[PDB]
């Protein structure tokens, strides 16, 4: 159908520097880095991904394809690739890491406004992916990255098996739709509302399918009013068409974000605060002089 005219930027190894390791797992190793292009007088904070088998290079390049094809404020985009012996993905630096660890590490300062705004942002990212006919297949709080506590983006399109985040049709029939992503969105919201609790803790992955067929779902988080929990529950209907659309989720959560204390009950809310550009030394190693974020540099 429509031709994909996305630009794949090839970047020189010499144009960027690795500073430290941010994470190292199955995906390979992710580094904090700086990208100093040609003679543009700019330093772009970046995240460098690297895993030498010919089978592995094919997988890192299929991920680069999807990641270079997206452009949305709530979706992680590929900045470029470096054609070294291994092959490196140059991505935007999300200084605060993944949302799962962020809600766990900062629960005592996470208020209703932040939780509800993150829900809007994730729904907006997902609705963009829907408009682009792209089905995520791995939406979880671990795959939502934090640029600033007030700005989150969806990542990991290396699937565009996590049973405990999957819709019933995905588990039993391997059916993946935008509606099956809505189920995963529901679990992601549950993870946030519980400040990073593990869904179905203790229960093995094979029992999940049987549990779901019975009618059993994730419990109501203590901070959740029936209004927020009803939305999570609607994301887990057997009939996929009965589940909300991401555009409905944008609207529903944003109505709630206008009067957040009416929808989430948190002890200490109002006296809670998270880092923001208002903070003295919010952006803080050596040279922080001509530094600019990827969202402001070049622009597609
Ligand atoms: C601790 C940490 N700090 C980060 C700063 N910036 C990014 N940048 C980006 C940008 C886009 N995608 C990704 N993906 C990283 C990933 C490990 C979640 S994955 C599975 O998608 O490769 N990272 C990733 C970061 N991390 C990872 C390892 C969770």
From Swiss-Prot:
One GO process term, biological-process aspect: digestive tract morphogenesis
Record note on what altering residue 259 to A does: Strongly reduced phosphorylation
Keyword Endoplasmic reticulum: yes
Effect listed in the UniProt record for changing residue 3 to A: Reduced phosphorylation
Protein name (database record): Epidermal growth factor receptor
Protein's organism: Homo sapiens (Human)
Modified residues (Phosphoserine): 276, 280
Cellular localization per UniProt: Cell membrane; Endoplasmic reticulum membrane; Golgi apparatus membrane; Nucleus membrane
Residues with PTM Phosphotyrosine: 283, 297
Consequence of changing residue 262 to A: Reduced phosphorylation
Quaternary structure note: Binding of the ligand triggers homo- and/or heterodimerization of the receptor triggering its autophosphorylation. Heterodimer with ERBB2. Forms a complex with CCDC88A/GIV (via SH2-like regions) and GNAI3 which leads to enhanced EGFR signaling and triggering of cell migration; binding to CCDC88A requires autophosphorylation of the EGFR C-terminal region, and ligand stimulation is required for recruitment of GNAI3 to the complex. Interacts with ERRFI1; inhibits dimerization of the kinase domain and autophosphorylation. Part of a complex with ERBB2 and either PIK3C2A or PIK3C2B.
Cross-link (Glycyl lysine isopeptide (Lys-Gly) (interchain with G-Cter in ubiquitin)): 20, 41, 55, 58, 214, 245, 255
Protein function: Receptor tyrosine kinase binding ligands of the EGF family and activating several signaling cascades to convert extracellular cues into appropriate cellular responses. Known ligands include EGF, TGFA/TGF-alpha, AREG, epigen/EPGN, BTC/betacellulin, epiregulin/EREG and HBEGF/heparin-binding EGF. Ligand binding triggers receptor homo- and/or heterodimerization and autophosphorylation on key cytoplasmic residues. The phosphorylated receptor recruits adapter proteins like GRB2 which in turn activates complex downstream signaling cascades.
Residues under site feature: Important for interaction with PIK3C2B: 297
Gene that encodes it: EGFR
Entry keyword annotation includes Transcription regulation: no
Active site: 138
Post-translational modification: Phosphorylated on Tyr residues in response to EGF. Dephosphorylation by PTPRJ prevents endocytosis and stabilizes the receptor at the plasma membrane. Dephosphorylated by PTPN1 and PTPN2. Monoubiquitinated and polyubiquitinated upon EGF stimulation; which does not affect tyrosine kinase activity or signaling capacity but may play a role in lysosomal targeting. Polyubiquitin linkage is mainly through 'Lys-63', but linkage through 'Lys-48', 'Lys-11' and 'Lys-29' also occurs. Deubiquitination by OTUD7B prevents degradation. Ubiquitinated by RNF115 and RNF126. Ubiquitinated by ZNRF1 or CBL at different lysines in response to EGF stimulation; leading to recruitment of the ESCRT machinery and subsequent degradation in the lysosomes.
UniProt keywords, alphabetically: ATP-binding, Cell membrane, Developmental protein, Disease variant, Disulfide bond, Endoplasmic reticulum, Endosome, Glycoprotein, Golgi apparatus, Host cell receptor for virus entry, Host-virus interaction, Hydroxylation, Isopeptide bond, Kinase, Lipoprotein, Membrane, Methylation, Nucleotide-binding, Nucleus, Palmitate, Phosphoprotein, Proto-oncogene, Receptor, Repeat, Secreted, Signal, Transferase, Transmembrane, Transmembrane helix, Tyrosine-protein kinase, Ubl conjugation
Tissue expression summary: Ubiquitously expressed. Isoform 2 is also expressed in ovarian cancers.
Resulting phenotype, residue 51 to F: Found in a lung cancer sample
């Amino acid at each position: 159908e429509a031709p994909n005219q996305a630009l794949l930027r090839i970047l020189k190894e010499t144009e960027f520097k690795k500073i430290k390791v941010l994470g190292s797992g199955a995906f390979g190793t992710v580094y904090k880095g700086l990208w100093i292009p040609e003679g543009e007088k700019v330093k772009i904070p970046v995240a460098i991904k690297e895993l030498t088998s010919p089978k592995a290079n094919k997988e890192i390049l299929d991920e680069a394809y999807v990641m270079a094809s997206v452009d949305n404020p709530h979706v992680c985009r590929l900045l470029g690739i470096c054609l070294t012996s291994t092959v490196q993905l140059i991505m935007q630096l999300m200084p605060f890491g993944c949302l799962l660890d962020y809600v766990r590490e900062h629960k005592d300062n996470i208020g209703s406004q932040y939780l509800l705004n993150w829900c809007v942002q994730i729904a907006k990212g997902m609705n963009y992916l829907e408009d682009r006919r792209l089905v995520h297949r791995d939406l979880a709080a671990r795959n939502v990255l934090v640029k600033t506590p007030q700005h989150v983006k969806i990542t990991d399109f290396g699937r565009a098996v996590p049973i405990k985040w999957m819709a019933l049709e995905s588990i039993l029939h391997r059916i993946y739709t935008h509606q099956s992503d809505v189920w995963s969105y529901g679990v992601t919201v549950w993870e946030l509302m519980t400040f990073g609790s593990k869904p179905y803790d203790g229960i093995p992955a094979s029992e999940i399918s049987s549990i779901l067929e019975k009618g059993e779902r994730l419990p109501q988080p203590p901070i959740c009013t029936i209004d927020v929990y009803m939305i999570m529950v609607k994301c887990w209907m057997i009939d996929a068409d009965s589940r909300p659309k991401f555009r409905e989720l944008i609207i529903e959560f944003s109505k709630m974000a206008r009067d957040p204390q009416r929808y989430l009950v948190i002890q200490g809310d109002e006296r809670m605060h998270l880092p923001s550009p208002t903070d003295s030394n919010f952006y803080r190693e050596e040279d922080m002089d001509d530094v600019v974020d990827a969202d402001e540099y070049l622009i597609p």
